[PDB]
Amino acid sequence: TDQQAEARSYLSEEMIAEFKAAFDMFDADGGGDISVKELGTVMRMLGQTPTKEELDAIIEEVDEDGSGTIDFEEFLVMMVRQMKEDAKGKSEEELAELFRIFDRNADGYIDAEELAEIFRASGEHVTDEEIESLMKDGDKNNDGRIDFDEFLKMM
Ligand SMILES: [Ca+2]
Ligand SMILES: [Ca+2]
Ligand SMILES: [Ca+2]
Ligand SMILES: [Ca+2]
Ligand SMILES: [Ca+2]
Ligand SMILES: [Ca+2]
Ligand SMILES: [Ca+2]
């Protein structure tokens, strides 16, 4: 499908070959797709405890031809979804802790001094004017402050 072709174009040949090796390990009978039986089996062998309904939910999430099983191109979609979700999570979680730390007076906002120290502590030389412009551009609602959602969006 459309979506399977996008997922593949996102991955290197090298990643795809590593995913095919894992897929071949789920596909216990070599038949070409992962069943409910097979998915639960390796999930339980990796210390997970899914319910049958959770096994069904996972399959249906990527099950584009309605077979009730996962073929390799569907597997690759499950993998790209997981990576992008990981990545997105890691970034927000890190920027949340950066905002926390450099909001040194704990008023809930980042001002131009605090913003200038984020950049210096990061090892990037920035000018005062650079900082004040980022402040301006970043201040979307024009209250003169940078709140968290403006911070996120700015970085
Ligand atoms: Ca199989
Ligand atoms: Ca459980
Ligand atoms: Ca079902
Ligand atoms: Ca259903
Ligand atoms: Ca399928
Ligand atoms: Ca502050
Ligand atoms: Ca603002």
Could you tell me the two tokens for 94? 């890190």
Could you tell me the two tokens for 147? 């709140």
Structural domains of the chain sorted by starting position, each given as residue range(s) with its CATH number in brackets: 1-155 (1.10.238.10)
**Strand 70-71, strand 33-34: pairing:** antiparallel
| Whether the Cβ atoms of residue 58 and residue 74 lie closer than 8 Å to each other | no
Q: How far is the CA of 83 from the centre of ligand 4 (A)?
A: 25
Report resolution (Å) to 1 decimal: 2.0
| Whether the Cβ atoms of residue 155 and residue 92 lie closer than 8 Å to each other | no
Note residues around ion ligand 5 (Cβ under 5 angstroms): 63, 65, 67
Q: How far is the CA of 59 from the centre of ligand 4 (A)?
A: 10
Q: Which residue has the tokens 């991955």?
A: 11
According to the entry, how was the structure determined?
Answer: X-ray
Nearest-angstrom CA–CA distance, 131 and 140? 15
Amino acid at 8: R
